[PDB]
Write a protein that binds this ligand. Structure first.
Ligand SMILES: *[C@@H]1O[C@H](CO)[C@@H](O[C@@H]2O[C@H](CO)[C@@H](O)[C@H](O)[C@@H]2O)[C@H](O)[C@H]1NC(C)=O
Lengths: 99, 49, 50, 147, 149, 225
């Protein structure tokens, strides 16, 4: 993963330090993660019901160019290498009750 | 693992489930229930004595 | 009296990998690293707090 | 609403329904469904058929067949209590969830729309009894009453 | 809310969606890649159980009018249901339909028996409050047993 | 009649906690010249009864105790242990909060016998996926690594346009948990093209979609099913 052109060292991007303009590949044509995939990596506190802080690195691309086309947003997004699936089919679920 | 270990396989079906689609149809479901209930009473009374 | 109870979901799901293949966030892994390796509940509670 | 795109689908679902189908809205929605379909129906085939081009593929394939047997046995929704209003029980991990027939709603289909007059109870399968001891032809067999 | 604005919002939520539904795995399962990870994983599991003990709403004596008591640090707030208020939610009136009575709430689990014969056992009483006036029983088992750690 | 002249009782406590009980309230009718004259016998509801606690009665989870530990797995070094649900939770009963499977580090008694892919002529991606040599220097990315492409100073003819993928084509490749009726992880790479652009029009006005290799046929009929 060193000099992928991708930051695979989560915080420090040290794998991309001081590495040649020749070595860094066009590893993928797009880097835009799905619009809030960071939220899928938060911890959760089950008693308070609150979402807590970032626990999983949900933008570890693993050197793959795992494009997905969202038909909803109509845009190409790059999934992380780990995520088992990420999909965009909408469900809309409306209760009105007037009395 | 190469040797059978029920747990580590079961993980497979946890993560990916048991089957894949050989064929199917995609589209959308529109499912609506609307239910209106209404009830009026009127009363009018006049006496002259 | 109105009630409106209403959801739009449009990321039908995400499924995170199992703990083996998940990549930990750097600060979370740093906090795990500094856990005392002994039942000092103060530290683990500060972890569950964050 | 399942499938389509959030704006038009929202539009539709937010339709009160007092006059039924908003034809315009619906149309829009259906074009969005052409843009972003949802899975309506399918024919399943077992995932172990895919374990095909890996090291030890045949070993892991047969292991995963065995596995899927056991797993079915352990987590088949047959062991759920029956859902009301002939909904289908399903067993996600260790919780049974009910999938509701159209015209039944609530979290477990407990209450039904005015049109769901039908009181017929559909006979979901019981769990497979254990395999019998090998018969006079060395076949074992097992049965599920459907009760 | 008028049609147009709900339209537009339901569009925008495509771009800033929030986690509205989730299935959860205990955080100790992630204890990994660290010195003593195997041990820290057990101590974290024990910390999860200690924390769920410390913040168990069992500690909170009941709120009237079905107010959910929650432990907030050392003290319990009552989250009164709509248009009910006060320290206990003793005041105002519930809107909408209620089945009535007082629903039963679990006492805190008694301390683990020390895995005698390798089985720990512990009990709770559902006295906090006792279900009254036709309110529904507390939901859950009275006792748990576990293998010794 | 103006029936609100006779206010209802409060609702009777629900007849049952958990299985669709009935609660009722009745008007506090007092017979009076008003009641006698204003047709209040004919056209007032004298009592009202409704559903309550229609939510099905909760069933709590029961877990069995763990079996013995596994034999130590030579390549995983982490013997497993398992237990069974004696009944699932449902109707909102107490969940199976404890873990259903446990793992413990172990020292194997035996060695691994697994082998490298070693897939002869076929191009071993860095992932170790083996792809048809045809696809090496495809001008695409069939490994995802681009390892097929890294050193390719010349590439085969890419199709003349970046065709859109089929709508939601990846849904067709997610695994399906038949016992749970729910989609699971991505199982087929419907992104993989196999170095060809089979292409289908939903309509002649549309830009054609690129049919991925894993799909043998795709139809775009609209049906009111
Ligand atoms: C996908 O949709 C296609 C177009 O509607 C289907 O093909 C049609 O099938 C009907 C019935 O056999 C024919 O009358 C028609 O000429 C056309 O071939 C196709 O079957 C369908 N796919 C599946 C798997 O059903």
């Amino acid at each position: 993963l060193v000099c992928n052109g991708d930051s695979d060292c989560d915080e420090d991007s040290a794998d991309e330090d001081r590495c040649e303009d020749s070595e860094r590949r066009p590893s993928c044509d797009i880097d835009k993660p799905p619009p809030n995939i960071e939220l899928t990596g938060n911890g959760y506190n089950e008693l308070t019901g609150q979402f807590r802080n970032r626990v999983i690195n949900t933008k570890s691309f693993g050197g793959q160019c795992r494009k997905v086309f969202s038909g909803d947003g109509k845009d190409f997004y790059r999934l992380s290498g780990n995520v088992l699936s990420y999909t965009f089919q909408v469900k809309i679920n409306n209760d009105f009750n007037y009395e | 693992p190469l040797e059978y270990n029920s747990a580590l396989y079961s993980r497979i079906f946890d993560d990916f489930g048991t089957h894949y689609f050989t064929s199917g149809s995609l589209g959308g479901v529109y499912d609506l229930l609307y239910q209106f209930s209404s009830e009026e009473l009127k009363n009018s009374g006049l006496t002259e004595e | 009296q109105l009630l409106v109870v209403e959801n739009t979901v449009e990321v039908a799901q995400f499924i995170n990998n199992n703990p083996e293949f998940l990549q930990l966030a750097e600060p979370f892994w740093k906090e795990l690293s500094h856990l005392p390796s002994l039942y000092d509940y103060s530290a683990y509670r500060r972890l569950i707090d964050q | 609403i399942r499938g389509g795109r959030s704006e038009y689908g929202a539009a539709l679902a937010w339709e009160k329904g007092s006059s039924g189908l908003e034809e315009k809205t619906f149309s829009e929605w259906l074009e969005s469904v052409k843009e972003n379909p949802a899975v309506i129906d399918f024919e399943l085939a077992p995932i172990v058929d895919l374990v095909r081009n890996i090291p030890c593929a045949v070993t892991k394939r047969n292991n995963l067949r065995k596995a899927l047997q056991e797993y079915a046995a352990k987590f088949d929704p047959c062991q759920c209590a029956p859902c009301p209003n002939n909904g289908r029980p399903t067993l996600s991990g260790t919780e049974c969830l009910c999938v509701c027939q159209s015209g039944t709603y609530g979290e477990n289909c407990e209450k039904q729309s005015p049109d769901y007059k039908s009181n017929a109870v559909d006979g979901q399968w019981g769990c497979w009894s254990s395999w019998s001891t090998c018969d006079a032809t060395y076949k074992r067999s097992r049965t599920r009453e459907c009760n | 809310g008028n049609k147009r604005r709900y339209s537009a919002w339901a569009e925008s939520v495509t771009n800033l969606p929030q986690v509205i539904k989730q299935k959860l795995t205990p955080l100790y399962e992630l204890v990994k890649e660290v010195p003593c990870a195997s041990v820290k994983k057990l101590y974290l599991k024990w910390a999860l159980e200690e924390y769920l003990d410390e913040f168990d709403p069992c500690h909170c004596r009941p709120c009237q009018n079905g107010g959910l008591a929650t432990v907030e640090g050392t003290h319990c707030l009552c989250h009164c249901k709509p248009y009910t208020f006060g320290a206990a939610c003793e005041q105002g009136v519930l809107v909408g339909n209620q089945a009535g009575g007082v629903d039963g709430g679990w006492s805190c689990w008694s301390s683990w028996s020390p895995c005698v014969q390798g089985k720990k056992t512990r009990s709770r009483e559902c006295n906090n409050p006792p279900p009254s006036g036709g309110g529904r029983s507390c939901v859950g088992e009275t006792t748990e047993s576990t293998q010794c750690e | 009649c103006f029936c609100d002249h006779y206010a209802w009782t409060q609702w009777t406590s629900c007849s049952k906690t958990c299985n669709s009980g009935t609660q009722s309230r009745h008007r506090q009718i007092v017979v009076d010249k008003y009641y006698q004259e204003n047709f209040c016998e004919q056209i007032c509801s004298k009592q009202e009864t409704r559903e309550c606690n229609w939510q099905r009665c909760p069933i709590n989870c029961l877990l069995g105790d763990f079996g013995p530990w596994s034999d130590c797995d030579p390549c995983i070094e982490k013997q497993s242990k398992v237990r069974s649900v004696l009944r699932p939770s449902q109707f909102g009963g107490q969940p199976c909060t404890a873990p259903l499977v446990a793992f413990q580090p172990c020292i194997p008694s035996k060695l691994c016998k697994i082998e490298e892919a070693d897939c002869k002529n076929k191009f071993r991606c860095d992932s170790g996926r083996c792809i048809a040599r045809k696809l090496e220097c495809n001008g695409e990315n069939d490994c995802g690594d681009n390892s097929d492409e890294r050193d390719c100073g010349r590439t085969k003819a890419v199709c003349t346009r970046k065709y859109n993928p089929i709508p939601s084509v990846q849904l067709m490749g997610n695994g399906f948990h038949f016992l749970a009726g729910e989609p699971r992880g991505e199982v087929l790479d419907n992104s993989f093209t196999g170095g060809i652009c089979k292409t289908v029009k939903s309509s002649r006005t549309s830009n054609p979609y690129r049919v991925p290799a894993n799909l043998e046929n795709v139809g775009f009929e609209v049906q009111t099913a």
